[PDB]
Amino acid sequence: SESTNEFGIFNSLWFSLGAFMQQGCDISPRSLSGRIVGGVWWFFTLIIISSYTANLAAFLTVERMVSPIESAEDLSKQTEIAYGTLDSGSTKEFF
Amino acid sequence: GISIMIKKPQKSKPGVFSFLDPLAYEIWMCIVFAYIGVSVVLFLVSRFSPYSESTNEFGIFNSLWFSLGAFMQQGCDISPRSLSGRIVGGVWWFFTLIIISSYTANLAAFLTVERMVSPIESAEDLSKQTEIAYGTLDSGSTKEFFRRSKIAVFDKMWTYMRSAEPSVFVRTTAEGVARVRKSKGKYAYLLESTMNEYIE
Amino acid sequence: RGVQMLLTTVGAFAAFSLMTIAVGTDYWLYSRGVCKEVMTHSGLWRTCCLEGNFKGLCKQIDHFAEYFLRAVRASSIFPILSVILLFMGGLCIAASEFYKTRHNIILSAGIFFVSAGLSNIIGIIVYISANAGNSYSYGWSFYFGALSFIIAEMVGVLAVHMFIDRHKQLTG
Amino acid sequence: RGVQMLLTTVGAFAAFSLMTIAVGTDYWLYSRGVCKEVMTHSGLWRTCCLEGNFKGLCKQIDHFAEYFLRAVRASSIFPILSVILLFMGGLCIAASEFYKTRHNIILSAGIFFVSAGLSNIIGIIVYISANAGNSYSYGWSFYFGALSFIIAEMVGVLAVHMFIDRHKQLTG
Amino acid sequence: YDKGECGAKDSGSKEKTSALSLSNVAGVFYILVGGLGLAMLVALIEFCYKSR
Amino acid sequence: YDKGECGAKDSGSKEKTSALSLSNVAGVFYILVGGLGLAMLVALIEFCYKSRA
Ligand SMILES: N[C@@H](CCC(=O)O)C(=O)O
Numbered sequence: 098s099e100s101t102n103e104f105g106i107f108n109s110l111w112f113s114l115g116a117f118m119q120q121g122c123d124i125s126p127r128s129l130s131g132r133i134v135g136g137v138w139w140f141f142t143l144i145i146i147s148s149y150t151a152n153l154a155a156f157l158t159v160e161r162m163v164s165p166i167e168s169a170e171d172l173s174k175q176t177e178i179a180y181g182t183l184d185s186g187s188t189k190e191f192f
Numbered sequence: 193g194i195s196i197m198i199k200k201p202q203k204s205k206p207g208v209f210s211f212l213d214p215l216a217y218e219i220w221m222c223i224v225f226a227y228i229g230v231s232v233v234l235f236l237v238s239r240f241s242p243y244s245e246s247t248n249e250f251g252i253f254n255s256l257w258f259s260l261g262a263f264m265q266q267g268c269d270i271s272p273r274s275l276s277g278r279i280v281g282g283v284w285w286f287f288t289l290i291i292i293s294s295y296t297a298n299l300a301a302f303l304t305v306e307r308m309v310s311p312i313e314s315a316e317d318l319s320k321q322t323e324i325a326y327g328t329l330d331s332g333s334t335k336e337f338f339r340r341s342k343i344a345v346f347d348k349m350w351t352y353m354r355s356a357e358p359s360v361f362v363r364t365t366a367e368g369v370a371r372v373r374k375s376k377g378k379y380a381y382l383l384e385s386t387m388n389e390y391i392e
Numbered sequence: 393r394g395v396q397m398l399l400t401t402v403g404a405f406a407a408f409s410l411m412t413i414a415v416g417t418d419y420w421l422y423s424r425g426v427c428k429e430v431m432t433h434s435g436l437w438r439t440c441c442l443e444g445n446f447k448g449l450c451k452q453i454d455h456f457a458e459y460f461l462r463a464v465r466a467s468s469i470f471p472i473l474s475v476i477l478l479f480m481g482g483l484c485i486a487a488s489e490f491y492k493t494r495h496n497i498i499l500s501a502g503i504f505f506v507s508a509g510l511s512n513i514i515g516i517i518v519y520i521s522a523n524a525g526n527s528y529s530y531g532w533s534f535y536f537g538a539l540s541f542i543i544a545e546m547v548g549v550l551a552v553h554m555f556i557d558r559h560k561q562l563t564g
Numbered sequence: 565r566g567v568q569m570l571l572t573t574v575g576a577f578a579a580f581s582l583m584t585i586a587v588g589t590d591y592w593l594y595s596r597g598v599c600k601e602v603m604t605h606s607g608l609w610r611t612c613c614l615e616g617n618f619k620g621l622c623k624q625i626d627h628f629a630e631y632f633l634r635a636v637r638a639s640s641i642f643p644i645l646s647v648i649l650l651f652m653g654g655l656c657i658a659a660s661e662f663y664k665t666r667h668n669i670i671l672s673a674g675i676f677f678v679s680a681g682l683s684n685i686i687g688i689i690v691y692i693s694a695n696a697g698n699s700y701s702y703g704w705s706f707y708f709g710a711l712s713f714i715i716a717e718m719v720g721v722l723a724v725h726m727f728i729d730r731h732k733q734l735t736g
Numbered sequence: 737y738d739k740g741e742c743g744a745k746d747s748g749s750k751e752k753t754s755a756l757s758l759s760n761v762a763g764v765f766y767i768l769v770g771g772l773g774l775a776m777l778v779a780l781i782e783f784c785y786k787s788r
Numbered sequence: 789y790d791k792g793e794c795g796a797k798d799s800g801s802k803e804k805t806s807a808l809s810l811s812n813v814a815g816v817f818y819i820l821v822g823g824l825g826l827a828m829l830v831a832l833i834e835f836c837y838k839s840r841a
C-alpha cells in the first residue's frame with residue numbers, strides 16, 4: 098500500500114526547494130508530521146531573508162575605506178609596499 | 193610622551209535570541225491569540241449548514257493548517273468558498289502584510305544607527321566633547337603645563353580642568369586608575385605614556 | 393461518539409471562575425507606585441502598597457479626539473461582557489437538557505464562547521495600550537485570563553463538533 | 565537488484581570510518597597559539613604545535629543560560645552520539661543476513677541513520693558558535709565530517725526504499 | 737560665554753533605538769477583530785434567507 | 789617585556805568588517821532542528837495506533 102502520495106524523494110526535494118523561495122508549491126502534506134515540518138522551514142526563511150535585506154540596506158548607508166596598515170609591526174610583516182628614508186638624512190644613520 | 197588613557201569598550205556579545213529584539217515581548221505574544229481566533233472562526237463558519245456539512249473540506253484541523261501557511265505568505269492548497277470566509281482571508285492577509293514590513297524596517301534602522309557610532313578617536317576632541325570627563329595628576333608637571341601652555345585647544349582644556357568639579361585632580365596613579373576602572377566609559381585620565389605602556 | 397457531552401459540559405464553569413477571579417483580584421501588575429515612590433502592586437480598580445512601612449495601605453485607582461477612548465478602559469466593560477456571554481453560553485447547554493430534539497438550542501453555545509474570547513482579546517489589548525504609557529511585570533490574573541480564553545475556545549470548538557454530529561445523523 | 569544491500573552497507577561503513585577518523589584527528593582548525601605565538605592546529609581534545617621548535621608538541625585543551633551551554637561544547641556529546649547511532653544502524657543492518665521475515669532491521673536502521681546525521685548539524689553549529697565566544701581556516705576533519713553527513717543523508721533513503729519495495733510486494 | 741554648558745544642542749551624545757511598542761501598531765488588531773465580528777454575521781443572515 | 793601579558797587583536801581577519809556572525813542568528817537553527825525532531829514521534833504514535841487495529 099506504500100507510496101499513497103506523490104512524495105517520492107525527488108518530489109520532496111522539489112517541494113522543499115519551492116518552499117524555501119516563497120514559490121508556487123501545489124502539493125500538500127495533508128498530514129500532521131508533514132504539516133509540522135512545513136511550518137518551521139517557512140519561519141526560518143522569513144527571518145533569514147528579512148535579515149539579509151536589512152543588513153544590505155545598512156551597508157549602503159555608510160562607507161569606510163579602512164586603512165591597510167598602522168604600525169611598524171605591519172611594516173615588519175610587509176607584503177609588498179616598499180619603504181625607505183630620505184637619503185643623506187640623519188634618520189638613515191639613526192636606523 | 194604624555195598619553196590619554198581609557199577603559200576598554202565592553203564587547204557586544206550577542207544574546208541567544210537577539211533576533212527577536214526588534215519587536216518587543218507583548219507583540220510576539222499577542223500574535224498567537226489572533227492566529228488561534230482566525231483558525232477557529234474559519235472552522236465555525238465553514239461547517240455551519242449551507243442551507244449538508246459534508247459539502248466542504250474545511251474541518252477544524254484543515255482550518256488550522258490554512259492560517260499558518262497564509263501567515264507565512266507561503267500560499268495554500270485550498271481556498272474558502274463562501275464570501276464570509278473570503279472576508280476573513282483578506283483581513284488576515286492585510287494583517288501579515290503590515291507586520292512583516294514593520295519588522296524589517298525596524299531591524300534595518302537598528303543596525304544603521306550602529307555603523308555611524310564614530311567612537312572617540314585621537315581624543316584631541318576631548319577639547320570638544322564634554323559628556324566624557326578626564327583627570328590629571330596633582331602636582332605633576334602636567335598641572336603646570338596646562339596652565340603654562342596657552343594653545344587655544346589646551347586653553348579650553350585648562351578652562352575645563354579649572355572649572356570641572358568634583359575635581360579632575362587625583363593624589364595617586366593607583367586611585368586615578370581605580371577611578372577609570374570604576375567610572376567606566378564616562379571617565380578618562382592623563383598620564384605619562386611610559387606608565388600607560390607599563391600598565392595596559 | 394456520544395461521550396463528548398460529558399467532556400464539553402466541563403470547561404465552561406472553570407473558564408468563568410478563572411475569568412471572574414482575574415477581574416476580581418488586585419494583582420495584575422508589579423510596578424513602582426503610591427497609595428497616598430515604592431514598589432507596588434495593582435489591579436484594574438485599586439492599588440495597594442508593599443515593600444515598606446505603609447505595607448497594606450491602599451487606594452482606588454486613578455481613573456484619569458482620542459479623548460473619548462478613556463471610557464473603555466475606565467469601565468473595562470469588555471471583560472464584564474465576556475463573562476456574561478460565557479454565562480449565557482453555559483446556560484445554552486443547561487437549557488438543552490430539556491426541550492430536546494430541537495437541536496438548535498445547542499448551536500449558540502459556541503457562538504457565545506467565541507465572542508467572549510474575542511472580548512477577552514480586545515480587553516487585553518486595551519489594558520496594555522493604557523498601562524504601557526519601569527521594570528514592570530505581570531501578575532497572575534493576566535495568565536488566568538489567557539488560559540480561560542484558551543479553554544473557552546477549545547470547549548466551544550468541540551461543542552460545535554457535537555452539534556455537527558448529533559443533528560446530521562438524522563439527515564442521512 | 566539486491567546488490568543495493570552491498571551499496572548501502574558500504575555507504576554506512578564509509579561514513580562511519582570518516583566520522584571516527586574525524587573525531588580522532590587533530591585537523592579541525594589552524595590558528596595561532598602556543599602549547600604553554602605560532603601557527604597552531606587543533607584537535608577537539610588537545611592543542612598541538614607546528615611551525616617551530618615545539619613542532620609535534622601537544623597539550624590538553626583549555627575548556628574554560630550559556631553558563632550551562634559551556635558543558636555542551638565541553639562534552640561534545642552530539643558528535644559522539646552521531647557515531648554511536650551510525651554504529652547502531654550499521655551493525656543492525658549487518659545482522660540482516662539472519663533473523664529474517666520481520667524487517668524491523670531496515671526501518672529502525674533508517675531512523676538511526678537519519679538521527680545520526682541530524683546530530684552532527686548540532687555538533688557543528690555548537691562548535692562554530694563556541695569558537696567565536698580570526699585568521700582561521702578549517703582543517704580536513706571538518707570536511708570529513710561534512711562528507712560523512714552527506715553520505716548519511718544519502719544511504720537512508722535507499723535503505724527505506726528497499727524496505728518499502730520488499731514489503732509492498734505483498735500487494736502483488 | 738564662560739558660563740555656557742549645554743552642548744546637547746548639537747546632539748553631543750547619541751541615542752539608541754528600542755523596540756516598537758504595541759501602541760505603535762495597535763490599529764491593525766482592532767481592524768482584524770472587527771472584520772471577524774462582521775464576518776460571522778453573513779452566515780446567520782444567509783441561513784435565515786435559506787430558512788425557506 | 790616579560791611583564792607585558794596581553795595581546796589579542798584583530799589580525800589575519802577582523803571582526804569589525806560588516807557581516808552578521810553565525811552567532812547573531814544561531815537560535816533559529818536550534819528551533820528548526822527541534823521542530824524536525826518532534827515530527828518523528830508523531831509518526832511513531834501513528835504506528836502505535838495502527839499496529840494493533
Ligand atoms: N632633518 C634631517 C634630515 C632628514 C632625515 O634625517 O631624514 C637632518 O638634520 O639630518
Ligand SMILES: N[C@@H](CCC(=O)O)C(=O)O
Pocket residue numbers: 329331332333334335383384
Ligand atoms: N613624573 C612626572 C609627572 C608628570 C605629570 O603627571 O604631570 C614629572 O616629572 O613631572
